[model samples]
Target: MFTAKLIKGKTYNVMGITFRAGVSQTVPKKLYEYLNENPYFILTQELNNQKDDPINYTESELKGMNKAEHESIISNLGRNPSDFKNADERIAYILKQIDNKGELEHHHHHH
Candidate 1:
């Protein structure tokens, strides 16, 4: 696996648990995808409100991550989860994901 040494604070709705801070390096790419798809997650921020909650993704944003700059953020988003039948296919899927869901802001102001 390629290694990049950068880190940041980000909240995630992990399997119904709020891992409300910096994600650990140990968490695998596969596991991150699983947690993201699970609806049980309610990724909230320090403010404790769902509208401003920071976790929720489609796929594209996952690809846009500068692999070296935002490893944790990449996985946290569902941009490039390793669920395809093969590596080549997985790469294709990820690119497609980024094309579709990557640009739109997952965030919306709650009224």
Candidate 2:
């Protein structure tokens, strides 16, 4: 499993790929290799934080999340939910970032 952190908008290097994390991004494969080898590697501001690692959300679970929840997550990622070509693809991309069980903290109303 890979560990990730929240990064502000900026260009970064991982696995030979240079991408900007205007919001957040999953840890890259190449960097994971480096991290494994360099166990002494210290996670600095670059990692965003060592406190709140990441919220792991399963595709099925995320799908079950309410519309408001989905919009909140989408905005947190610095993207407008409407920017997506379609809702189907949107959820897929969201789940791709997760690697384990999530908070699973749902707040559904009891009607």
Candidate 3:
């Protein structure tokens, strides 16, 4: 089981379970996988982890990242790294977006 938190400001009902926004609950792995794919929910550990860590990155740290790492972080932000000139620019833009929103916007498609 994994803990998932509803990030939106509304209630969600799934598989007979009612989840309130901003509330975290333990759920079966299958259900957690489903919820994690939904933009409204995210794994609790991810919410606290540096996958989007609370600490902001220093410019120097971001500069030290390799191409793949830079691309990965940008992709996680629902952005295309190609849109920026380089890693620093990409990270700067995404960080600003994240700061403005107070969180990462998990963009995904629904089947």
Worst ten-residue run, lDDT, model 2?
39-48
Model 1: per-residue Cα lDDT at residue 22? 44
25-107 per-residue lDDT for model 2 (tens digits):
34556665564464333333243454442333567877787777666776776667766655576677676557344445555
Whole-model Cα lDDT of every candidate shown, in order: 0.41, 0.54, 0.69
How far residue 81's Cα lies from its native spot in candidate 3, in Å, is 50
Find the candidate with the highest lDDT and give its number: 3
Candidate 3 to truth, TM? 0.37
Q: Candidate 3, clashing residue pairs?
A: 50-53
Candidate 1 lDDT by residue in tens digits, 1-111: 211111223565444544444433333456445544554332322322434212333345544534432333335554544344343444454455356555445667832
Q: Is candidate 1 or candidate 3 better by TM-score?
A: 3
Runs off by more than 4 Å, candidate 1:
1-83, 102-111
Preferred candidate (lDDT higher): 2 or 3 = 3
